[PDB]
C-alpha cells in the first residue's frame, strides 16, 4: 500500500512532467506561424475596418 | 485479492488524473493557439488605431465611409457623431460629402450634417463619423474597433484557412 | 354492459390494470384446469382399475 | 441601439420602429442596468417587430433600454476542430474551455435529404451494453429511441453508451479518424450535468466528442434550440468532413415541455394535454437529421432518449416518437427497483435495422438464432416463472424448469452488464451460447442446425 | 428614467393598470395611491402598464395614484433576521401587529424587515480599514440570538476597491451604517444590512458535488432513497397523512445549521401550532435549552391572504436561504403547500391572458419552478474565506386523491432530483407513513453510495439487496393474491414473511411515540441487517432441508427481537445489540 | 378564449390604425 | 351617480361618462318599475364604469333607471339585536319584524386574520352522533368540509348535528340560493329543538334572486366574524347549497368573458375559495371560538369536480356521505373511507377525551380498510370470504356498518358511549388482529 503511494506519488511528478512536456512543440509551431502573417493580419484587418461600404 | 483491487483502484485515480491532465493540456493548447490569434487581432487593432492617426489618407476614406453611411440611412436630415478634435475635419469635408451624397443617391439627396453635442471618446473613436437617423432609431459605428470587430467573422475562414491551411 | 357516468382518468388506470391482471389471472386458472384435469383423468383410469 | 422598444409583456417583447426585418432575427438588448441580454426575434411586421429575451424582460425598463440588431438567423460555426470544445445553451463557454476558431460558418436549419441520395444502414453500430448491441442489434442510419422513467439513471446509461461508442467500431480490422459522439442537454438537474461533466472529462471521451448542455435553471430557449444546433454539429462532420458520427440526446421531455413553451409564446391555444399540433413535424425535423449518404462514407447514427409521462406509454412523446422512429428501447421499474443492472425489457426491446446490423462480415452468425433464442427463453421463463407461482416448484416441466433456470440465469447474468463497463460483441456472443448451454441441444428450438455444429463447444 | 407620477387608468379586481408610469422599469415594486398601499408592476404597453397589486383591492375606487421606482422587488438580509415571524414581503408580522395594536392586520402598513429598535453587538475584526476586501467576505460577526453566533455581516456582491474607515467595534443596530467603501465610484457608505432581490438568489463561486449526507430520521426514507446535504428531495402528499409531525420530527433532526421556511397559501393555525411547538421543543444539546424557534425561520403567507403574496413568498424564501449559502453555512429550505403556488400561479397566468395548459398552470412555468429548485445546491460562497455551504430545496405536491396524474407532479417530476413517492394504498389502510415500492428512487443514490463507501456498506450496498427482497416480494404477492396461500413454495413462504417482517420491523416509524419518534441511521442499519440476517439464514435453512411450518414454530422471539431493532434510544448501545442478535443467530443453528 | 384575445387584440390593432390616421 | 348607461349584457350593467365611480362599491339603483334594488360595481376603466346587479338587470329602462353610486365599499349594519329574528337576501327583515337599531356598520367581506395574533383551537365540542365525535372529530374553531349528493339529506344530517349539539353555542347560518323545500325542513327542525331564539341568518331562497345570495353569505359571515370578536362566545358558521354559489361565480365571472377553469368557476377563484374558509379561526385574547362548516353539493353526485376538489384541498378534512349508505336504510351514513378530520390530533388522548381514542380511531380505519377488500374480495371470488382475515374483516365491516355507523339522527350519544359501543364491537376480532393498537391499548379494555 505504502509502495502503491510512493508510485502515486511519483505518478503525480511524471504526470506534471509528461503534461507539461508535451505542451512544448505545439505552442512554438502556432506562435511561428502567428508571428510570420501577424503583420499581414493586422493590415488586412486595417483594410477591412475602414473599408466603404 | 486485496492487492489486486488496491491496484485497479490506484490505475483508475492515475488513469483518471491522467485522463484530465490530457483534456486540460489539449484545452490548454487550443487556448494558446486561440492567444495567438487575439494577439494577431490585438497587433491589427493597434495597426488600425495607428493608421487611424493619419487625416490626409484618411479623409477621402472618411468623406466614401459618412457617404456609404448616407447611402445606407436614406433619411431627409442626417446626425454625425464624431469626435471633438475630428468636429472641425468632418465640418471642412461637409461640402464634398453633402455633394456626394447627393450624387450617389438622387433619390435620397442629403439636406443637412448637424453636429452633435456629444464629444467622442478619444480611446472608443480613432477617427472618423457616425451618420445616422434623427430619431436615432438606427445607429451605425464607422469606428475601427466595431469595423475590424465586424470583419473578423467573415475574416475567420479566410484567416485559419490561410494559417493552418 | 357496465358503464360509469362519472370518470376521472386514474379510474382508468385502475380499471385497465385490474383487467390485465384479471386477464392473467384467467390464464392461470386456464393452465390450471388443463393440469388438474389431466391429473384427474390419470386418477380417473387409475380409479376404474 | 434601439430604445424603440413598444412593451414588454413576459419574455416576449414587441418594438416599433423597425426597418427589413427578418424571421428568427438574432438582436441584442441592453437593459437599463447595462446588462447585455441575448434575444431572437419572434415575428416580424411592416410597423413593429417582435422578439424573445432569453434573460427575460424582468427588470428592463422600456424608456431606457437599448436594442442593437444583429439582422442574423440562428447560425452554427461549423469547424473539424471543433471537437473538444465545451459550450452553453447560446453556444457560449461553459467548462471555461477555448474558443474554436472556425472553419466555416452555417445555418442552423438545415436542409431535409434528397429522396434518390438516401442510403440505407449496412455496417453494424456496437452498442457496448450486454443488452443493447445484442438483443435487438443497432446499424448506422437507424433511429432507436431510448424510453427511460422517473427515478432510473438514463445518464449512467447514457454516459455508459458514450463510453461503448467510441469502442463500436474496433474490430473492424475509418480508423484513423475517431467517431464523433455529440452531446445535447435540455433540461438536466444540476447533479446530473456535473457528474455527466466528471464522467465525461474522466473517461477521457471529453476530448474526442463534443457536449452541449442546458440545464433546467438556463431558459428554455436554449434547451430546446441546443438539438438543432448539435444537428448540425453531427451535419458538418457528415456531408462535409465525411466521418461516422454518433447523436444521443438527453431528457426529450424536458425538451418537449420546453417545446410547449416556445409554442406557447406564439400564444396559441395549446393542443391535446397541452402540446402543439404540429409537434408530429417539430419531430419530423429532428429524427430526420440520422441517416446514411449516397456517395458520402461519414454517416450520422441518432439514439435520443426520453421519460414517459407518469410511468405511461400512452404519453404524447410515446406516442410521438413510436410511429416515426424505428424500433424502441424502454426501462423495466421492476428492473431497476431489484437492484440490479441496466433495466432494459426484453420484451420491448427491438430495432428494425437489426437486420442490417448483424449477421457474418457484419456482427456475428451466432448473433441472430441466439438473440431470438435468449429472448424465448426469457419469454417463456416469465410465463414458467407465473406458472410456477399458481402450481407451485413441484409441477415443473421439462421446457419449464430449463426456463425457470434460464430466465434466472439470464436475468442475473446477461442482463448484468455494469456502470462504465462495455463488453465486446464477441463477449456477448460467448457468453450467450455459454448461457444458453445450461439447456441441452434439443431445448432450443430457435437453434438452426448449420448454427448449431459450428458454434457450440 | 425615473421621477415620474402614474395615474391609474383601470381597476378590475387586484390588478391594475396605470398611464404616466414610464419613468419606472418593468417588473419592479411601486407603492400605489395615497394610502401607499404595497403593489408589484410587471407588464409595460406603451406609454401605460400593467400592474398586480400584492394586497387586498377591496374600497379602492378609481383616480387612485402611482409611483414609480426604477429598481424590482426585494428583501433584507442580516443580522437579526433570525426567531422572526414576518408576512410575504418579509415584513414582521408581530412588530406589524404591536404597530398596529389592533387583530386585524392594517393594509399598506410599513415596517422594516429587521429591527432597528434591537440592540446587537457589532464587530469589526475581519479586515481592517485600508485593506482590500470583496463581496462574500465576512467584516465582521455578531450575536443574534442566545443559541447561535448567526450571521457573520459580508460585504455585498459586485463590491470591490479599498476600505475607507470602520465604525466598529461597538454597540449598534442593523440600520446604522458600520463602514464606508472608497472605490473608483468615490465613497460608498456600508451598513449591517444588505438588500437583494427575492426572485434572484444569492450568488456564489462555484458549484460542487455535495459528499455530505443528510439524515432523515425515518427508516425508509433515509433509506430507499438516499438523500445528500443541498439536495433537492419531493415529500409530496395531502393533509392527514401526518405530514405534520413527520415535517416537525425532521426539523429537529435536520443535519442543517440554519433553517428558513417560507408557507405559501397555508392555514395559519399550523403556523401558531408551529411557532408553538418550537418552545416547547426546547434543544438541550449540549449546553443548556434552547427555543426550535430560534434556529428556525418562519414566512407566513395566508391562503385567505393574497393568492400573490404566497409563491412569491416562497421565491423569497429560497432567496433567504441563498443568503445562508452565500453565508457559508448548510440550510435546508422547507415549504407547506406547492399547489397553492402552483394554483396562485394559475390565477397569475390565468388572469394574464396568456394561453395556458391544462389545470390552470401556465406553459413557462416549468422553466420557473426548474429555477425554484436550481436556485439552490451545494458550493462554496463568494469572498476570501472559501467558506462552503449546502442549500437544500425540499418541496411538497399536494395531488388529489393521490393520483399521479398530477400536473404538479408532472412538471415537478422532470426536475427535482430526488422523489419518494406515498402509496394511497398503505396511507388509508391505517398503516404507518406511506412509501410506493417500484416508484420511490434516488438518482443522487450513486454519488450518496460513494459518500457512503467512507461509512461502509450496511446498508448502503445492502439497499440493493432489500430492494431486490421488496420487489421480488411485490412480484410475488402479486401473483400470491391471484394464488391464495393454497399452492406456494417454502422460498415463497419465507419471501412473504419477509415482505411482512420488512413491512412491520422496518418501513413502520411513529412520530407520535416516544420512542419511535426518530430512528438513527447505524439504528436503522441494524434492523435492516437482522432483516437480512434472519431472511437469508432462512433461505440457507430451506437449502438444507427444513421445512417452513417447524422453523416457524422454533424461534417466536427472534421476530419479536429483530422488529424492536429500530433506535429507541441511540446510538450507544448499537454494538450490545448487534452482539444479542449475533448470538441469537448463532444459537438458533 | 384565445379566439378572444386575437378578437380583442384585433380592436386593439384598429385602435392602433385609427390613431394613426 | 349616473342615469346614462351605456350597455348591459345580462345581469352586468355598464355606463359611460362616469366619474369618481368605486371597484367593489355599494351602489344604490331606481328602476323604471318604481323598484329599487342594490347592486356592486365590478369594474372601472377611463371614463366608463362597470356595475353589476345583484338582483337581476331584468325589467329596467336604460333612460328611466338612476344609479346612485355611494365612492364606498359594501358596508353592512352589524347588531347584536339580530338574535332569533330573520333577514332576507339583501338583509331586509323576513321575519315581519322592524327594521333593529344598528349597533355597528362595517364590511361584509369581513377582515383577515393577523399571523401572528391566531390560536389554533385543540377544543373538543361533542357532536352527539357515535358516527361523528368518534370518527372525525368535532372541534369548535377548527373547519370542517361537507359535500354531498343530489337527493343526499344533507339538510336533515346538519340539522340534527346542530340540534344534538347544544356558555351554549351561538349558530349563523349563510343561505346562497336555499331551497324553498330546504327553508321550510331547516325552519321546522330549528323550531322543533327550540334554539331558533338562539340563532340568527339571512334567507335568500330558489324563488327569489340567488345572484343576491352571494352577498348573504358575506353577510353572516361579517355576523360571525362580529360575534366573536365582540360578544366572545363560541360561533359556528355555515353556507347553504354552496354549489349554487359556486355555480352563481362561475356565471359572473363567465359573464366578464374572462379565463374560465373547470365547471366555468374564475382564475383567480384560488382566493375566492379562500373568503369561504376564512369565515373560521380564533384570535388572540378573544374568548370565543368562530368555526365555519360549510355544506355544498358535488356535481353528478362526484366529488372529482371542481368544487369538492377544491373544497377538499383547502379546508383540512372533509365530512362525506355515501350514496349507497343512504340507499340501504340505515341511519346518517358517513364513510370512513373518505371522511377525516384533522383536528382529531389535539383533540384526542389524555386530558381531552380518553386514552383509547386515536387507537381505536385508526384501528376503526384499518378494520374498514380491510373489510373493504373483504367485500372486493367477496364480490369478485365466492362467499366463502377469503380465508380467515377477510371473514373476520367483512363480517366486522358489515356489523360496524350496522352498529357504529348509524347511531341516529334524533339520538344524542357521548363519546363514552360510543366508546364501549365500539368496545363491544371490537370483541369479534381478535386482540392480535389490530395492528395499529399499542401495548397499552391491547390492555387497555379487557371488561
Known sequence: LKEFEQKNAGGVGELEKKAEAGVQGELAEIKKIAEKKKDDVVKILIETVIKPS | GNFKSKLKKAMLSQQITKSTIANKMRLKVLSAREQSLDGIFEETKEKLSGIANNRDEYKPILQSLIVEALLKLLEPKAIVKALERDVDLIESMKDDIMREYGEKAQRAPLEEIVISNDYLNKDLVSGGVVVSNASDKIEINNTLEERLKLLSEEALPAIRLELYG | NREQVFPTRMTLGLMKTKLKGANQGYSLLKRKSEALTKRFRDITKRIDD | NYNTVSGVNGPLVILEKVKFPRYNEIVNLTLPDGTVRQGQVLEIRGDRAIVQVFEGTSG?????????????????????????????????????????????YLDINGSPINPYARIYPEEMISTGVSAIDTMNSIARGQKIPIFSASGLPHNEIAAQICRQAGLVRPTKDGHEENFSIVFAAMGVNLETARFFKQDFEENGSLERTSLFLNLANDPTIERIITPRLALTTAEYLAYQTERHVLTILTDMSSYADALREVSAAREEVPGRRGYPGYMYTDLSTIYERAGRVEGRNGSITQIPILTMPNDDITHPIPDLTGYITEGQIFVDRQLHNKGIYPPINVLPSLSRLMKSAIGEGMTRKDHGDVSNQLYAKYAIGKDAAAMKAVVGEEALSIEDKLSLEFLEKFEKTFITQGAYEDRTVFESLDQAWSLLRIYPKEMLNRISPKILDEFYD | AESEYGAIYSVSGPVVIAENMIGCAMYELVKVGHDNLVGEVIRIDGDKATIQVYEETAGLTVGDPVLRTGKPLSVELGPGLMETIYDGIQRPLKAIKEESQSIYIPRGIDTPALDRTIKWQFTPGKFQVGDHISGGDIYGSVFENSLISSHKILLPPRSRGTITWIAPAGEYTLDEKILEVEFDGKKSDFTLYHTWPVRVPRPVTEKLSADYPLLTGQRVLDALFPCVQGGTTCIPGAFGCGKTVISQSLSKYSNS????????????????????????????????????????????????????????????????????????????????????????????????????????????????????????????????????????????????????????????????????????????????????????????????????????????????RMKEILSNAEELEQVVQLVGKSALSDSDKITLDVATLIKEDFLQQNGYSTYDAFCPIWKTFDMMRAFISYHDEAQKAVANGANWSKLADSTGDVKHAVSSSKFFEPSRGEKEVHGEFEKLLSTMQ | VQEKKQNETAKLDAEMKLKRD
Open chain 4, 60 to 104: 428592463i425598463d422600456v424608456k431606457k433600454t437599448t436594442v442593437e440588431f444583429t439582422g442574423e438567423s440562428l447560425r452554427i460555426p461549423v469547424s473539424e476542430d471543433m471537437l473538444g470544445r465545451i459550450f452553453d445553451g447560446s453556444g457560449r463557454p461553459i467548462d471555461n474551455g477555448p474558443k474554436v476558431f472556425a472553419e466555416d
Open chain 5, 257 to 464: 445549521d440554519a433553517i428558513i421556511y417560507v408557507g405559501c397559501g397555508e392555514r395559519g393555525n399550523e403556523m401558531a401550532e408551529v411557532l408553538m411547538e418550537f418552545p416547547e421543543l426546547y434543544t438541550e444539546m449540549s449546553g443548556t435549552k434552547e427555543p426550535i424557534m430560534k434556529r428556525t425561520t418562519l414566512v407566513a403567507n395566508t391562503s385567505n391572504m393574497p393568492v400573490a403574496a404566497r409563491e412569491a413568498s416562497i421565491y423569497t424564501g429560497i432567496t433567504l436561504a441563498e443568503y445562508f449559502r452565500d453565508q457559508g453555512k448548510n440550510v435546508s429550505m422547507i415549504a407547506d403547500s406547492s399547489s397553492r403556488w402552483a394554483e396562485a400561479l394559475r390565477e397569475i397566468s390565468g388572469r394574464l391572458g396568456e394561453m395556458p395548459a391544462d389545470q390552470g398552470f401556465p406553459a413557462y412555468l416549468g422553466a420557473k419552478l426548474a429555477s425554484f429548485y436550481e436556485r439552490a445546491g451545494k458550493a462554496v460562497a463568494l469572498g476570501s474565506p472559501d467558506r462552503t455551504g449546502s442549500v437544500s430545496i425540499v418541496a411538497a405536491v399536494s395531488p388529489a386523491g393521490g393520483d399521479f396524474s398530477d400536473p404538479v407532479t408532472t412538471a415537478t417530476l422532470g426536475i427535482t432530483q430526488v422523489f419518494w413517492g406515498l402509496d394511497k394504498k398503505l396511507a388509508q389502510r391505517k398503516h404507518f407513513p406511506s412509501i410506493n415500492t417500484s416508484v420511490s428512487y434516488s438518482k443522487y443514490t450513486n454519488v450518496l453510495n460513494k459518500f457512503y463507501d467512507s461509512n461502509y456498506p450496511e446498508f448502503p450496498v445492502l439497499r440493493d
